[PDB]
Amino acid sequence: VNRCIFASIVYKSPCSPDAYHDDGWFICNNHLIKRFKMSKMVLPIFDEDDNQFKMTIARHLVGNKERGIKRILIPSATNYQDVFNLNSMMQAEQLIFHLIYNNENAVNTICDNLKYTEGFTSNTQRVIHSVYATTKSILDTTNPNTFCSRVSRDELRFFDVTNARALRGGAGDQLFNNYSGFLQNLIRRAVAPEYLQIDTEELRFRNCATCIIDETGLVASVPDGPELYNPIRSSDIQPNRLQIRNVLKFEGDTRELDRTLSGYEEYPTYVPLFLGYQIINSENN
Amino acid sequence: VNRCIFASIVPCSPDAYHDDGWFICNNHLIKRFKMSKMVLPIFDEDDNQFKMTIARHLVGNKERGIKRILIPSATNYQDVFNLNSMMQAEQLIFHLIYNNENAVNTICDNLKYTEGFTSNTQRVIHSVYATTKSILDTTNPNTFCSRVSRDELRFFDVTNARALRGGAGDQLFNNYSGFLQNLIRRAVAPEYLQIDTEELRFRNCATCIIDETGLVASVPDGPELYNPIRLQIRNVLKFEGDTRELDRTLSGYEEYPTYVPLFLGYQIINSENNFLRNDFIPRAN
Amino acid sequence: VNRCIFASIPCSPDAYHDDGWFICNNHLIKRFKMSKMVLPIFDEDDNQFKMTIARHLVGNKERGIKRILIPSATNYQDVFNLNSMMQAEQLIFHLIYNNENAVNTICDNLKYTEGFTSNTQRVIHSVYATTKSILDTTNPNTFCSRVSRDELRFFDVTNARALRGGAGDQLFNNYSGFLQNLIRRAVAPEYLQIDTEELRFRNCATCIIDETGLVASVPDGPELYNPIRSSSQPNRLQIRNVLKFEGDTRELDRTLSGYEEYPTYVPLFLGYQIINSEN
Amino acid sequence: VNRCIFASIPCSPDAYHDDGWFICNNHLIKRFKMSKMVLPIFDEDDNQFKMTIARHLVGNKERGIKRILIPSATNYQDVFNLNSMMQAEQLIFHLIYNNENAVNTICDNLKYTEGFTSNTQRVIHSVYATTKSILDTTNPNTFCSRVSRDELRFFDVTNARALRGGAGDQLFNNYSGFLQNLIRRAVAPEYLQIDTEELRFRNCATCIIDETGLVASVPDGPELYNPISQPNRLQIRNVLKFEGDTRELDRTLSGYEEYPTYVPLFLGYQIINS
Numbered sequence A: 001v002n003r004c005i006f007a008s009i010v011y012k013s014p015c016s017p018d019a020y021h022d023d024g025w026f027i028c029n030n031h032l033i034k035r036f037k038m039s040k041m042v043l044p045i046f047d048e049d050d051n052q053f054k055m056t057i058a059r060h061l062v063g064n065k066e067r068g069i070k071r072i073l074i075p076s077a078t079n080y081q082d083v084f085n086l087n088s089m090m091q092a093e094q095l096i097f098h099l100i101y102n103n104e105n106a107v108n109t110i111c112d113n114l115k116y117t118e119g120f121t122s123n124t125q126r127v128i129h130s131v132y133a134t135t136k137s138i139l140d141t142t143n144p145n146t147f148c149s150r151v152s153r154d155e156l157r158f159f160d161v162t163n164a165r166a167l168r169g170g171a172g173d174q175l176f177n178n179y180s181g182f183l184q185n186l187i188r189r190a191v192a193p194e195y196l197q198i199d200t201e202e203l204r205f206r207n208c209a210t211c212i213i214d215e216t217g218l219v220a221s222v223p224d225g226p227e228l229y230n231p232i233r234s235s236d237i238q239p240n241r242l243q244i245r246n247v248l249k250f251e252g253d254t255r256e257l258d259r260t261l262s263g264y265e266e267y268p269t270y271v272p273l274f275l276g277y278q279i280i281n282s283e284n285n
Numbered sequence B: 001v002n003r004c005i006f007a008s009i010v011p012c013s014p015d016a017y018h019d020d021g022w023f024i025c026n027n028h029l030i031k032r033f034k035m036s037k038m039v040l041p042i043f044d045e046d047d048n049q050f051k052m053t054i055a056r057h058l059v060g061n062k063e064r065g066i067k068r069i070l071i072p073s074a075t076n077y078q079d080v081f082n083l084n085s086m087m088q089a090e091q092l093i094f095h096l097i098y099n100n101e102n103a104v105n106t107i108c109d110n111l112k113y114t115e116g117f118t119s120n121t122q123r124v125i126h127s128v129y130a131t132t133k134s135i136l137d138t139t140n141p142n143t144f145c146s147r148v149s150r151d152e153l154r155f156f157d158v159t160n161a162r163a164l165r166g167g168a169g170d171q172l173f174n175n176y177s178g179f180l181q182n183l184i185r186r187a188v189a190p191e192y193l194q195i196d197t198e199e200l201r202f203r204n205c206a207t208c209i210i211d212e213t214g215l216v217a218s219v220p221d222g223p224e225l226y227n228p229i230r231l232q233i234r235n236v237l238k239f240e241g242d243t244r245e246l247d248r249t250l251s252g253y254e255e256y257p258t259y260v261p262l263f264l265g266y267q268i269i270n271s272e273n274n275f276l277r278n279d280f281i282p283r284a285n
Numbered sequence C: 001v002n003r004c005i006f007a008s009i010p011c012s013p014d015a016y017h018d019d020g021w022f023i024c025n026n027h028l029i030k031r032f033k034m035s036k037m038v039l040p041i042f043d044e045d046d047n048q049f050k051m052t053i054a055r056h057l058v059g060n061k062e063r064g065i066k067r068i069l070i071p072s073a074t075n076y077q078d079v080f081n082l083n084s085m086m087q088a089e090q091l092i093f094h095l096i097y098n099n100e101n102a103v104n105t106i107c108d109n110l111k112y113t114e115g116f117t118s119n120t121q122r123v124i125h126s127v128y129a130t131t132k133s134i135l136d137t138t139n140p141n142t143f144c145s146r147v148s149r150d151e152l153r154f155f156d157v158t159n160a161r162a163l164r165g166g167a168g169d170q171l172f173n174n175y176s177g178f179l180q181n182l183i184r185r186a187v188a189p190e191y192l193q194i195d196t197e198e199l200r201f202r203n204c205a206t207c208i209i210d211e212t213g214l215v216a217s218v219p220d221g222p223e224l225y226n227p228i229r230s231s232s233q234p235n236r237l238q239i240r241n242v243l244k245f246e247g248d249t250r251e252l253d254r255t256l257s258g259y260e261e262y263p264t265y266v267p268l269f270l271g272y273q274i275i276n277s278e279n
Numbered sequence D: 001v002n003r004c005i006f007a008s009i010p011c012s013p014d015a016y017h018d019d020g021w022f023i024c025n026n027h028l029i030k031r032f033k034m035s036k037m038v039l040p041i042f043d044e045d046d047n048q049f050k051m052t053i054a055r056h057l058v059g060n061k062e063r064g065i066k067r068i069l070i071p072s073a074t075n076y077q078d079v080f081n082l083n084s085m086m087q088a089e090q091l092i093f094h095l096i097y098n099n100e101n102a103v104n105t106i107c108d109n110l111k112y113t114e115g116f117t118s119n120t121q122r123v124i125h126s127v128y129a130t131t132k133s134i135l136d137t138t139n140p141n142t143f144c145s146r147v148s149r150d151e152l153r154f155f156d157v158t159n160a161r162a163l164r165g166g167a168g169d170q171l172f173n174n175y176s177g178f179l180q181n182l183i184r185r186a187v188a189p190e191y192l193q194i195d196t197e198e199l200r201f202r203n204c205a206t207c208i209i210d211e212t213g214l215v216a217s218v219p220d221g222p223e224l225y226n227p228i229s230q231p232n233r234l235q236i237r238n239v240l241k242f243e244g245d246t247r248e249l250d251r252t253l254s255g256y257e258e259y260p261t262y263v264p265l266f267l268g269y270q271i272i273n274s
């Protein structure tokens, strides 16, 4: 039932129960925290008030104080190994990552290593092969670059729209493609465009984008100036050597005054992901 | 207790009864200015909290010009306010607000010309008048001994705050009646806040632009964002709610608000904090 | 009997307890960031006894003027928004600093009020008269006994062998005897010349005195860490910068509890002192 | 249950439990006139954290040899009469100080008198083997097989700023790894760069380590107030010159806090980055 690759892995995998349901997302929200700093979300859209589309969206908890690498949400096939250091991680995780990045050479090296171990042949071979095949089969349950484009559509999505005060830049759609198509689907669920064309009409959803794609990887960054403050809830996640941090935090009184005011309309303040443009065909000409 | 200015009417929401500086029902707020009494929760995620007002615009997307105007400039009041439709009390209120002494005295003589004034309704009417008067009087920051902002100053552009530049919008704000200034400063959340030692950016991009024509909802650039809500045409568009159910997973997903709240102007705090926050003094710069 | 001066007008319990200190610990903490305490002493043996020493409480990250514990009579008018607190405290401050001009100014400002010609005048006379009475009980006039007296004894270690001291050592003699005494009561002389031998009790003085007043400055290097602990304004808020650590040895701490604890503080030491024959 | 070295054939309650001190505090005083202690410190964010430290009680003593806290391998056999101990414990000290020539000299007298039934050979050799095993548990490099892989520490602060502690640190490295370990227990650094955070903890170091041994104090002039052949029979008697109160006037101050009354060992420089 549980789709999650981590739920396939064998420790604990206390997946968020959603993964047992129709949505079919590749990852439990828990592991979404684990490596991605992001929460799946919805942004319902409607005109006749039938709430029709309920389109998915994602929010990130990237700390404002993060710099450099930590700004990167998802590293490129270049240097993801350096970003992650999978030796901090189990062999199953290493396998999965190498598969996703198509590091088939490393996959070969791991299978060579395990070959000569008796615990491989005696016990683990069924686990390794079942996980390998199952994972790849899941990927190829979509892989719309392959498989007749059975899943989704051409979809007419673009992420590449000009920043008008930028130069005529734009690159690494090649890299987008090179991402295993489950990644591309994930993005197509994470990031809404600022714009959509209806078959006869265009609609705009935010004043400005919120995220960018470097050749290095997806980066939550302002196009200019300081990053916005992110109040990371800190409700959710080792320091075997002791770990320390400074932090800047509130102090002050008077909060009681809100007792009455709390009745008013209240605004959620998370950081959504915006980038790109969409259209629906009037006809599949 | 009910302190909506439109209690004077000779109907307000119960929410008006809170002792709060709105001095208006959400009812009349909507019915005149297409806005809602909203608030911002702000957190430092120890569950240390801070809070501010919000009011999303409600005016429909398509309509233009005066339709984009939320409240006209005094020089342009009647262009929006079709006074002839609007009851003399309403007219007098507005004229006072805009300082239209001329119209005030005009209505004064109209009292006599309304030979029904012989009915001694004048007593009630003028009582209502003075009632109204009271509130403006209280709002008047110019009263010598009234308390004023000194830890704080609000501005209506980034540059205007950052260098006290001759922001024409800020100039015209000052020129407006003190009540209007008060209501604006009450309603409008900034894009940025400087702090006694720090600065915070809430969004990379402002909501709207305003100019000497009046209070204006216009976007800074491009098209207005989507804004949802007998011999006539309902003209409704409709779209394929095919019932492709997904709630079985999505129901837990957090839903981003579909609203256009205010991120307009720039606040400075630049002093040893002595907020004294629990008082609605005019608190002028 | 309440000993604290401020109790005239929330005092710590030691105010009403038999403190030899002038001031309640609450007021001391608020104003000058210090805590009242002691050190024991031994006649080479279990035959042991005490001497008072305070420790200051100022943070590691305080800088410039903030480094001052007790400013001089000049700079204190800048260090403290004297307007920030009730007129009576202003008058008390001016009296203790001998700012009698400002005292008279406050008196005139009060008399200007039309409500002064009432029981307000009685209250004011009573309060400041009692304050002055205590002050003059502390201020030398024919003072000769052990109690509440000192007599030409030096902290300048180098000239104290000559029974002399530098102008900086003289400095506090410029202040009221109240100040001079309570200073020396709080801060231990690090060298001592007992009537029989001279000894040292610490090698590295923890605090310094300047014309600006009492500076809780390190003589050298970076300032030492301080945990600000315990101890208000509905009006006020701000942001705090908080260091913290993780990786707790919680179950090893059980074993760590098994041996003597040495707490850490900044006890106040400087200079030198001569001691009289005692009985 | 848990044991110190001196469980080797008395033991102390201090040695019912250990964290790599592996001596009674009894023996700490008995040998080097010091007591072990903990140094709790905190941030008020419920952020308590503790360090190990020791204190000596040998202030106001004179001419060095009286209050040297630790000998040197060059001189320990001189400053301590080896005849003070029996049952070849001299060999244990020779191991600790790396005088394996003296170890062999003792073994020359342990093979002599075979002790067929009592197996005095074994009687010494079991202790010696456990000593060597513990010493290489405190191996001078603590190679990763040796749990308790130490973090960096420096003592010559001035080159610890260059991470190049000089002759003092070289001599420390030459000293037996157990000595190094126990120094890590006893001596708090004057400075720690905890993720570059160069904290300072005291006005000044107290003790100083010479190539000849640990000296309780750098200065010998400004000595600090310090409370506390025919052996087993000596007596000393004291005289004091200070008429005063009958130790009751101080009862006024019975309520207030008192500052600690010790001279802990503060010395050196440390870095702990990532």
Ligand SMILES: [Zn+2]
Binding pocket: A004, A005, A006, A007, A013, A014, A015, A016, A019, A027, A028, A029, A030, A031
């Ligand atoms: Zn999972």
Ligand SMILES: [Zn+2]
Binding pocket: B004, B005, B006, B007, B011, B012, B013, B016, B024, B025, B027, B028
């Ligand atoms: Zn109303």
Ligand SMILES: [Zn+2]
Binding pocket: C004, C005, C006, C007, C010, C011, C012, C015, C023, C024, C025, C026, C027
């Ligand atoms: Zn008091």
Ligand SMILES: [Zn+2]
Binding pocket: D003, D004, D005, D006, D007, D010, D011, D012, D013, D014, D015, D016, D023, D024
């Ligand atoms: Zn023992």
